Amino acid sequence: AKSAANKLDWAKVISSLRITGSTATQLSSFKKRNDEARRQLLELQSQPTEVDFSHYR
Amino acid sequence: KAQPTEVSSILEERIKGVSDEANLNETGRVLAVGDGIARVFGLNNIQAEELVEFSSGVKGMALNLEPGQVGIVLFGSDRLVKEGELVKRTGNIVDVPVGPGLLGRVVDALGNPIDGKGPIDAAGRSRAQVKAPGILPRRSVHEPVQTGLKAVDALVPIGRGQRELIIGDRQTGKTAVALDTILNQKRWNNGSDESKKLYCVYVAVGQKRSTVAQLVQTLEQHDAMKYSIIVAATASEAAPLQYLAPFTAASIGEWFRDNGKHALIVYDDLSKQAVAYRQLSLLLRRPPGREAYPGDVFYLHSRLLERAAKLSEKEGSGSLTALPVIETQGGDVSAYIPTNVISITDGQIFLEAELFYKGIRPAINVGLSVSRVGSAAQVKALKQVAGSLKLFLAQYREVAAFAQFGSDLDASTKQTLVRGERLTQLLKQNQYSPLATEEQVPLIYAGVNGHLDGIELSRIGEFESSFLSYLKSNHNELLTEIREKGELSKELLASLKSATESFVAT
Amino acid sequence: TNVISITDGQIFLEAELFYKGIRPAINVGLSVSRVGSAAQVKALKQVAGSLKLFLAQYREVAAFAQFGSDLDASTKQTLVRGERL
Amino acid sequence: QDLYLRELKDTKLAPSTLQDAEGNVKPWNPPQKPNLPELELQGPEALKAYTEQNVETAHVAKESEEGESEPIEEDWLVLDDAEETKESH
Amino acid sequence: STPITGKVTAVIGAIVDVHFEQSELPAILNALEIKTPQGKLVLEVAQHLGENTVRTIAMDGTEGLVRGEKVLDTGGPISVPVGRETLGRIINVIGEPIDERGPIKSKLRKPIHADPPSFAEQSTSAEILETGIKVVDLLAPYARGGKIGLFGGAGVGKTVFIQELINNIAKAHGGFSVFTGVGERTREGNDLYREMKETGVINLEGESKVALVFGQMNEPPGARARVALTGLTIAEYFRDEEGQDVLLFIDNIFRFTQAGSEVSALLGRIPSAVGYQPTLATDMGLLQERITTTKKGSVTSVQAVYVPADDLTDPAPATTFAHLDATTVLSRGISELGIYPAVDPLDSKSRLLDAAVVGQEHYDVASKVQETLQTYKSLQDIIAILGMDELSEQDKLTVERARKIQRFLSQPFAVAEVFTGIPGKLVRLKDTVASFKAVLEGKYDNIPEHAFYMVGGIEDVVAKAEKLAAEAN
Amino acid sequence: WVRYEASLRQLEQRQLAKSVVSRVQSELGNPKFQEKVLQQSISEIEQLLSK
Ligand SMILES: Nc1ncnc2c1ncn2[C@@H]1O[C@H](COP(=O)(O)OP(=O)(O)O)[C@@H](O)[C@H]1O
Ligand SMILES: [Mg+2]
């Protein structure tokens, strides 16, 4: 689902003809970008909630 | 506790058995000591390079066997040993524990556990001095080693089995690039395919104990200690420890290599090993050969680094990639020890101090850093993009020197000069930042294909991050295709071209 | 190096000013007295403070000899004072 | 030999009344019987963060907020700013 | 014990050969005392030639030595008196107090060549000592058990900085100090001793804060080599006896390393041609191994390496930053502005200045201060060239905040009360962080710039501000 | 906690070392010479006979 959203967002960014002179939509763009970066960081750095007592205890 | 009691009882039973068996099979009386070299009488039929037990407890080994007197270099402090001390011989050549148990453990030159984490479990004991594999057992270097530097280390690779040198002055990044390579090997040794895992082994010879402690701390911070052996001899112990630690690291490396596994060994700052051999030879009665260096320094470098090789499929297809490091003075690569080690290795990586002071943290000079795996023993994606980029960068440097010589059709008007300067600014990296091979092709491809003419030198640093984010956010298709295929085909080349001239406008 | 380490400061001499014409070829940049200030007659000590900065500035801006005509007025004045001293 | 029994009794008597069994201390004056499990119980606690990280404080952070049910006012503010940005296009 | 004795066989300049009997041969690094009319001379063993003869190196001149002279064996390394009785006393390499203040009444004598700790005992924990001066403990915080150093010139206040450091460690940490005199000029040594006495930190009739071990380099090279060893022994005894984070003061690593190289040259070793020193590996490494962190205390050596005309020749002084964990440069430029601490905040970097080492807020404050100072000098260039007008309001805010920080770096020294008459203060690390961050956000911008001058702590900042607003304004 | 337990094991080991050296010093004082001398003299005699 994120792939199509990124595709359309980037296509809109690169196809701006009468969509220039903006101040806050780019801010929301970086907000979404850093939100996705935090998503990826959380998935790659998922610590183990339960204690791994099978091998650690 | 319970284990010390039974361990002590068993070992002292073995000690009594040894004392009651064959007397001791040879002894000797100490004639002289000093600087870690000890003369001793007796030992009439002592083996060459044989470990010997001293009454005080210090270990020894036989470099010299004179008529009557025996040249023993002392493995440890010479304070304990005195005149007349009985010198029992162990009955075997100098050995070191080798096996999978050394993973995650720090040991000395002799292989004894020094990290205090417990005993070392070794499959066997290998001689510290082992003849290098022959021509047929050796194999052409074809398997890449992922350096993870996003620099010339990628365009001109290392590969599995090369002894790629790392020359440069002190505090230029030699240990830095070594540790970045070790960290980058985690992505491949964290899986299950043993044919791609690179079980690293560090040689921190001539390194202060605080520095090696910080190094191992950084290793286990990034979960790199699980596959790295830190067999080394710090500056605290005697010169023979420094001389033998890299050789026992080589023994561990061959054990990994002879078992079909792939191991990366970094001989960090062999200069202290050479000067430790100097210290041995000065008082072992071996006259120096050249420049106060005994002649056998070249031979010892030869035997130590030629053990590093890529085995053939008959021998198990193992690899023993070596990363020798030398600390030169003032960038003098024409000094003796440089000349030997640059002639002992398969290419070098120059790290001049001026580039480090300029701001380039890798500080690698493209012009002199050569290798024998140009567009070979690489991933394939990087080898097609930059198979001959080093020569182009060297010519860029020469023309830029030529450009400043006289005002002509040069400077920004030269496409070659612009491409070379943009690529040189591209080849940069921060420490503790291992970059995978997939996020390295687009940058070099943009540099080589003349797509960086209108990006400006100052903005290339931001362009790198923007382009990498572009791939990792909305162009992961071709990036993952390159990563999984390990090569860029016509489809992948077209996709990368699409990405690069779509993002050239930004 | 042993001699400069044992000695409490040195006064460097070079034959090159000896050949150009400055026979007392004492160069301040490499010469130093670690206890000279504490053991100097007070008049010269108080007046020589301005000498050091003047000649140091002259020697550092001495690289462009035939250029101070249009480089900067301050550089020209520094060169004048330095050669006078 | 003599050592074969002497050192085993040495390492089975003092370690017995030194730890594991955890009672008395014959060989040396300072006792580690109440030192390692009682005084050193707060050892790592002093080394690490106490009452914050050792107890894993259940810090219930404030939930993510929103536009606070902003009415059409912000909508026409956005309309106005978009219009004044696009007027000079 | 048997009366171990020997007979002198050769005197190789400083080297002395002594012939012992069977089983009477002492080991190497073992003191061998010889009774001489000019006092007491001892020799440490370094080489065993053989035939019951051991090569030794004298700790003093071998004047009047005769073959067959009786040589008494101490039994181990060169034992030096240790304890609080050694504080404020000039003790040589051998151990005899050379301050002309009488014998040292020490109850213990720990050998200089003590066994170094093991690798498993090498504590890698990195925590920062509180010094007592904001600039050092914040900009380049001192590593505990590491190798920190001072790199300053002459007349910038390096010696008075040493005095303030030792006084603050004695009062804040409660730990004594040691200063070594390896390769010392006796003139500057006498000047340092006079300043030490006049600062009133070593009360001769009272408490002394520094055990000023001192070895003249007019002595043979072995004395220079082992004066660092005996200073290390004093520091180690203080650490292992009292729960003190004592700090060690090496006056120069270069002098110790050159002394070691000539010791090796006399013994029969040689460096490489055209100039290069790799021989120091054993002694330099052992000296580093003698400075670590133990469970009960710690020793933080100071490498007060004087700048050799911006040219470090020997490899050990060359690129000291490899061995350095917290650089403290004493530049003349900052002292020209009048800031009493000559620590250059921009060039004083520390390897322990990290978020996970000193703290999140500590790292944030230090990084912000460094960035503000960099912007301050960068905009000071254009202020001097094009004037103050060519500068923006955000640049104005950054410049004024960084200027307030720089003027705040000047803090009183408790040892300068006689040198310039200032009420020396001992700041707190938490107080230092609080004051620096409070200056950082700009909540103290209304405070006059002169108030930030010559103060320690934000409470003193507001006190000076209200004093200025009450007396002058 | 695991590194604290490792430090506990290390300090227990060094305390065992101190106990061992203290008992060695105690053995250096008590009359424990003739019996062990006879014992390992018989041991060396048996060692010679075994070969
Ligand atoms: N991005 C970077 N890349 C490499 N080194 C860096 C970087 N940033 C800082 N450094 C510093 O460079 C030093 C590298 O020194 P090193 O190469 O280990 O010395 P040596 O060559 O004597 O082994 C490190 O101490 C580190 O603090
Ligand atoms: Mg290094």
Give the position of tokens 């012939």: E19
Distance CA E136, CA E155 (A): 19
- Count the neighbouring beta carbons within 10 Å of the beta carbon of residue B481: 18
E strands along B55-177, which residues? Answer: 59-65, 70-75, 87-93, 95-98, 124-127, 167-168
| Residue among E50, E267, E270 whose CB faces B32 most closely | E50
Determine contact, residues E410/E340, Cβ cutoff 8 Å: yes
Three-state DSSP class for residue B306: helix
Nearest to B84 by CA among B47, B58, B55: B55
Give the position of tokens 């310039």: E420
Distance CA B109, CA B74 (A): 12
Partner-chain contact D11 B16, CB within 8 Å: no
Q: What is the largest CA-CA distance in chain F?
A: 55
Resolution of the structure in the document, Å: 4.0
Determine contact, residues B189/B227, Cβ cutoff 8 Å: yes
CA angle E115, B111, B250 (to 5 degrees): 130
Nearest to B111 by CA among B100, B120, B101: B120
Distance CA E438, CA E430 (A): 12
Structure tokens at B328: 């030169």
Distance CA B187, CA B339 (A): 35
Nearest to E250 by CA among E159, E347, E182: E182
Distance CA D17, CA D27 (A): 9
E strands along B236-333, which residues? Answer: 262-268, 319-322
Partner-chain contact A21 D86, CB within 8 Å: yes
For residue E34, what are the β-bridge partners?
Answer: E41
Question: Per this entry, what is the length of chain F?
Answer: 51
Distance CA B261, CA B259 (A): 6
Give the position of tokens 């925590």: E127
Nearest to E168 by CA among E192, E133, E203: E133
Helix (H) or strand (E) holding E73, with range, is strand E70-73
| Nearest protein CA to atom 7 of ligand 1, as residue | B431
Three-state DSSP class for residue E41: strand
| Nearest protein CA to atom 18 of ligand 1, as residue | B175
**Helix E281-289 and helix B209-221, axial crossing angle in degrees, nearest 10:** 60
Distance CA B118, CA E132 (A): 42
Distance CA B284, CA B288 (A): 11
Distance CA E10, CA E68 (A): 9
Determine contact, residues B146/B187, Cβ cutoff 8 Å: yes
Taking the CA atoms of residue E215, residue E220, residue E224 and residue E225 in that order, the dihedral angle to the nearest 10 degrees is -140
Q: DSSP letter at B350? A: E
Strand order, beta sheet including B201-204: B201-204, B262-268, B319-322
Structure tokens at B261: 């596994």
List CB contacts (< 8 A) between F41 and chain B. Answer: none
Partner-chain contact F35 D2, CB within 8 Å: yes
Nearest to E293 by CA among E236, E225, E229, E356: E236
Distances (CA, A) of B395 to B233, B331, B449, E455: 42, 22, 16, 59
Task: Provide the CA B41 distance to its chain's centre, in angstroms.
Answer: 39
CA angle F26, F27, F32 (to 5 degrees): 145
Nearest to E76 by CA among E45, E50, E55, E105: E45
Strand order, beta sheet including E245-250: E210-211, E177-179, E245-250, E298-303, E147-152, E327-330
Choosing from B125, B286, B372, B483, the catalytic residue is: B372
Q: What is the largest CA-CA distance in chain E?
A: 88
Structure tokens at B9: 């009882």
Is E158 noted as a catalytic residue in this protein? Answer: yes
B32: left (phi > 0), else alpha (psi -120 to 50), else beta? beta
Distance CA E214, CA E93 (A): 7
Identity at E457, one-letter amino acid code: G
Three-state DSSP class for residue C57: helix
Identity at E137, one-letter amino acid code: D
Nearest to B169 by CA among B88, B282, B269: B269
How far B277 CA lies from chain E's nearest CA (Å)?
11
Helix (H) or strand (E) holding C48, with range, is helix C42-60
Structure tokens at E467: 């004093």
Distance CA E210, CA E164 (A): 11
Please name the residue ranges forming H helices in E272-422: 281-289, 332-336, 360-386, 393-408
Give the position of tokens 């000395």: B108
Structure tokens at B414: 């030269």
Distance E249 CA to ligand 1 centre (A): 26
Distances (CA, A) of E298 to E85, E129, E181: 20, 10, 21
Structure tokens at B374: 């140009």
Determine contact, residues E134/E435, Cβ cutoff 8 Å: yes
Question: Per this entry, what is the length of chain B?
Answer: 506
Structure tokens at B332: 């003098």
Disruptive mutation site among B6, B10, B12 for chain D (greatest number of D CBs within 10 Å): B12
Nearest chain A residue to D85 by CA distance is: A21
Which ligand has the minimum distance to the alpha carbon of residue B203?
A: 2
Nearest to E418 by CA among E196, E131, E191, E86: E196
Distance CA B307, CA C64 (A): 57
Pocket of ligand 1 (CB under 6 A): B 170-176, 361, 430-431; E 322
Identity at B438, one-letter amino acid code: E
β-pairing, E15-19 vs E5-12, is antiparallel
Distance CA B336, CA B339 (A): 5
DSSP B271-282: HHHHHHHHHHHH
Nearest to E157 by CA among E386, E411, E357, E382: E411
Distance CA B96, CA B112 (A): 8
Give the position of tokens 């002879």: B258
Distance CA E142, CA B78 (A): 35
The ligand 1 atom nearest the CA atom of E351: 27
- Count the neighbouring beta carbons within 10 Å of the beta carbon of residue C68: 18
Q: DSSP letter at D62? A: P
Partner-chain contact B5 D15, CB within 8 Å: yes
Give the position of tokens 């705040």: E408
Structure tokens at E425: 């203060």
| Residue among E267, E282, E318 whose CB faces B238 most closely | E282
Distance CA E263, CA E286 (A): 15
E458: left (phi > 0), else alpha (psi -120 to 50), else beta? alpha
Question: Per this entry, what is the length of chain D?
Answer: 89
Determine contact, residues B380/B486, Cβ cutoff 8 Å: yes
Determine contact, residues B167/B229, Cβ cutoff 8 Å: no
Distance CA B15, CA E391 (A): 82
Question: CB-hemisphere CA count at 13 Å for C10?
Answer: 13
Helix (H) or strand (E) holding E79, with range, is strand E79-82
Nearest to B279 by CA among B270, B290, B292: B292
Q: What is the Rg, in whole angstroms, of the alpha carbon atoms belonging to chain C?
A: 15
Distance CA B201, CA D6 (A): 42
β-pairing, E177-179 vs E210-211, is parallel
D19-42: string of b/e by CB count within 10 Å (b at 16+)? beeeeebebeeeebeebbeeebee
Q: What is the Rg, in whole angstroms, of the alpha carbon atoms belonging to chain D?
A: 35
| Nearest protein CA to atom 20 of ligand 1, as residue | B171
Method by which this entry was solved = cryo-EM
Structure tokens at E25: 């041969």
Residue E218: partners with Cβ closer than 8 Å, 6 or more residues away: E186
Task: Provide the CA B451 distance to its chain's centre, in angstroms.
Answer: 36
List CB contacts (< 8 A) between B238 and chain E. Answer: 282
CA angle E87, E91, E92 (to 5 degrees): 155
β-pairing, E70-73 vs E147-152, is unpaired
DSSP E42-69: EEEEEEEEETTEEEEEESS--TT--TT-
The ligand 1 atom nearest the CA atom of B168: 21
Nearest to E342 by CA among E130, E153, E73, E104: E153
Please name the residue ranges forming H helices in B89-208: 152-155, 174-184, 186-189
Distance CA E254, CA A28 (A): 59
How far C18 CA lies from chain E's nearest CA (Å)?
23
How far A18 CA lies from chain B's nearest CA (Å)?
18
A interface toward D at CB cutoff 8 Å? 18, 20-24
Distance CA B261, CA B194 (A): 7
Give the position of tokens 């900085």: E161
- Count the neighbouring beta carbons within 10 Å of the beta carbon of residue E361: 14
Residue E457: partners with Cβ closer than 8 Å, 6 or more residues away: E425, E427, E428, E431, E432, E435
For residue E71, what are the β-bridge partners?
Answer: E6
- E to C contact (≥3 Cβ pairs closer than 8 Å): yes
Partner-chain contact E217 C32, CB within 8 Å: no
Determine contact, residues B80/B36, Cβ cutoff 8 Å: no
Distance CA A15, CA C42 (A): 79
DSSP E8-25: EEEEETTEEEEE--TT--
Three-state DSSP class for residue A10: helix
Distance B243 CA to ligand 1 centre (A): 25
Determine contact, residues B155/B389, Cβ cutoff 8 Å: yes
Distance CA C23, CA D8 (A): 86
Structure tokens at D6: 């002497």
Disruptive mutation site among D5, D36, D53, D56 for chain F (greatest number of F CBs within 10 Å): D36
Distance B175 CA to ligand 2 centre (A): 5
Nearest chain D residue to F18 by CA distance is: D28
E448-473: string of b/e by CB count within 10 Å (b at 16+)? eeebbbbbbbbebbeebbeeeeeeee
Q: What is the largest CA-CA distance in chain C?
A: 46
List CB contacts (< 8 A) between B12 and chain D. Answer: 3-4, 7
Give the position of tokens 């055209």: E274
β-pairing, E177-179 vs E147-152, is unpaired
Structure tokens at F1: 């906690």
Residue B87: φ, ψ to 5°: -115, 95
Distance CA E71, CA E55 (A): 13
Distance CA B38, CA B52 (A): 11
CA angle B149, B153, B159 (to 5 degrees): 110
Distance CA E127, CA B40 (A): 48
Structure tokens at B267: 């001989």
- Which residues of B line the annotated binding site for ATP? 168-175
User: Is E333 annotated as ligand-binding?
Assistant: no
B119-149: string of b/e by CB count within 10 Å (b at 16+)? ebebeebbbbbbebbeeebbbebebbbbbbb
Helix (H) or strand (E) holding B40, with range, is strand B37-40
Nearest to E197 by CA among E67, E76, E88: E88
Distance CA B478, CA B465 (A): 17
Give the position of tokens 């650490």: E239
**What is the interface size between B and F, counted as CB pairs within 8 Å?**
16
Is C81 noted as a catalytic residue in this protein? Answer: no
Nearest to E79 by CA among E65, E95, E61: E95
Nearest chain A residue to B473 by CA distance is: A6
Q: SS3 string of E144-183?
A: CCCEEEEEECCCCCHHHHHHHHHHHHHHHHCCCEEECCCC
Structure tokens at B53: 């037990």
Tally of helices (H runs) and strands (E runs) in chain E: 12, 14
List CB contacts (< 8 A) between B505 and chain A. Answer: 14
How far D60 CA lies from chain F's nearest CA (Å)?
26
| Nearest protein CA to atom 8 of ligand 1, as residue | B431
Nearest to F44 by CA among D6, B9, B18, B19: B19
Distance B275 CA to ligand 2 centre (A): 16
DSSP D27-47: SSSS-STTIIIIIGGGHHHHH
Which ligand has the minimum distance to the alpha carbon of residue B169?
A: 1
Choosing from C34, C59, C81, C84, the catalytic residue is: C34
Structure tokens at B427: 């080849």
Distance CA E402, CA E395 (A): 10
